[model samples]
Target: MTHFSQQDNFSVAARVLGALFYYAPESAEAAPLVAVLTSDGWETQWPLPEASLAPLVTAFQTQCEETHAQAWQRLFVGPWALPSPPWGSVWLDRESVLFGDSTLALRQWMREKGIQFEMKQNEPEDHFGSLLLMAAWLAENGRQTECEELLAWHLFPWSTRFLDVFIEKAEHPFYRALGELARLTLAQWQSQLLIPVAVKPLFR
Candidate 1:
């Protein structure tokens, strides 16, 4: 029988969820992950409750012609405005702007921990997907304390709220289901971790 430790489960889910959240669905980085999610048996290894996972599994399994690319374009790169912008600073700061003070704080934390992530020019380090990916990286390196800190300090505080709005506004069934799954997974981590989450006023 194959056995996976808790760290492995967290890392696997984080890597899969992070790629899906961060990349365009048609992009090379995320396309394969999207493909596997449509198939059966992926959920047995996931950490979420089987009953709750069933609906999301069906969401992916159900046939739909709405291209992932179209959903990606509308959800993440709208000519108008994104339903819920994925960056942490946008939700945590009073100004609700990119690169807010909270972003700098997370940058300082990364520097202290020696975590290096190659980011786009002018892109904030607090992008929801990027942070999730970072957490997985930390897990892979066995940096459990830092991983907990990242989720506790930078992510859980705002992420649940962000995901709440994302589910409400996702428009596309795939994204909505994705949001639901992410929310459930994070809630599990939030409960399991012993660290204290920072309390902050949410602007969005």
Candidate 2:
């Protein structure tokens, strides 16, 4: 019953999520897009309903660039330890460490499925933004089964917890809005796809 094509849905979602998580809003690559989202009502272009995103949209209207940049660094690219490390393995693995066993497992699965991804940084394959971007690629390429597997097995297991903490702790309006948006979008995806997320003990 959706008006948007599947590829369009995933592609736009990937771009927005990637902007928020992969690059700082102040970065040249992300700044213009981030501005559009904040000032130009860009979320209206996505399939998400206005009613669902009302609060987040309101929050975006008031976001400040300086605070948002500082918050992004503190939350993700920290000089100190990140409060919410964006890697899935940090939440899933027993050791709660980056590039843990779950990360290797996801890498093995991607290789077996012939999925290749290039990261912007030298980091684990289980990064939150990376997974969302991969989902976009899979959906655009007609790899629906693999996309579902990626969500149900890899991202879904830990993402809710990560987003929950991210929302609770992020002081800046931009990231808090992004966290809410991501959480709601994932819930919509689950409902639409009937994806039953596997239960796993989160070490974080």
Candidate 3:
């Protein structure tokens, strides 16, 4: 039997990782999470194997507090062009722009699914971080079918590519580590996934 308990761990990972990417490092939403994640004993309790987590854990620990926050700012809330923009529309649409067709499609899907979520002002629903948090909520609420649809269709399509570029472009160790962890974590989720993920053409 594929262990059921592990799915519970996936939910936890999804929310934790999602929040880190969604909010500022020092923001109210993510600060406590960063505190625990960078603490002495957090890795041992992580869902992944310690061997795999060791290096990423070290990456988290190596952050310079000031620069770490700047990294999040530069990448997510930038006045300059972001190296890898977080919205799914950027990767999924023909032209790399926010609020593209894919965002509308995802918005339609969320409407059909009856998923209500509070969003950041003017942010698209298919943002990498927001989707992950939504996935966690769906799973935690036992809405497996919707969770599967969200991941298989909405998330898995472009997450790997976005994260791959994100890891490469991120200068901060924390974000680099976060990207690596997200990639690995999603791959793990895919292994347990029942639905077939669609292979969509990614323009970016």
Candidate 4:
């Protein structure tokens, strides 16, 4: 997600949280954990509070150089990869196998919405962090409502579960904090989205 590159702004804190989770396998489990939770019919999306992320970004930036960094990066960035593929359909199917029936469903959904994924067929629909960028795009285009529903139903469900396992596998202390940060942010996002803007007035 481009927002991930804008570490200078707190607007990208969600991306930063995800990056940190990727940095820590235990935190990364948050994704699959969310998947499990949502699969079981629990709420999945979470919110991030408005705050500066200098401390968090700096902490993860330092830890990103460890031996595990390459493995985590490769998980998402490529060179060598794994089963889940980190995108959307990989876990959505009951089979939990690559290019499962969910891929057809996702392709149909994207076609109906006119949403195009940047990377070609080389990548699967489940690539990590791609959905976040999609969410940002949907929000920018005044499709926040659909974005919220899709993210809740399609992405957050599995992503949180994935993060749960990732955080458990993380070896670094900074990553532990990062995992907590992600959990908090996710909780916040879920709550915020549930409340309609019309339900409360905004102050100037």
Q: Where does candidate 1 stray beyond 4 Å? A: 1-8
Candidate 1 C-alpha lDDT tens digits along 149-177? 99999999899999999999987878888
Clashing pairs in 3: none
With candidate 3 superimposed using the best TM-score fit, by how many Å does residue 24's alpha carbon deviate from the native?
0.4
Task: Evaluate residue 161 in candidate 2 and report its C-alpha lDDT on the 0 to 100 scale.
Answer: 97
Where model 4 places Cα greater than 4 Å from the true spot, the runs are 1-11, 14-68, 71-87, 173-179, 195-204
Model 1 worst lDDT window (10 residues): 1-10
lDDT, candidate 2, 69-154, per-residue tens: 78888998879998788999999988888889999889899999999766657678898988888888887777778888888889
lDDT per residue, candidate 4, 5-53, as tens digits? 2222323444444343333444554544423322422222323332444
TM-score of each: 0.94, 0.91, 0.93, 0.58
> Roughly what TM-score does model 2 have, to 2 decimal places?
0.91
RMSD values, in order shown: 2.7, 2.3, 1.9, 12.1
Report lDDT (Cα) of residue 13, candidate 4: 43
Candidates 1 and 4 compared: the better one by lDDT is 1
Q: Name the runs in model 2 displaced over 4 angstroms.
A: 1-8, 63-66
Task: State the displacement of the C-alpha of residue 2, model 1, in Å, after optimal TM-score superposition.
Answer: 18
Q: Cα deviation of 46 in candidate 4 (Å)?
A: 14
Off by over 4 Å in 3: 1-6, 63-66
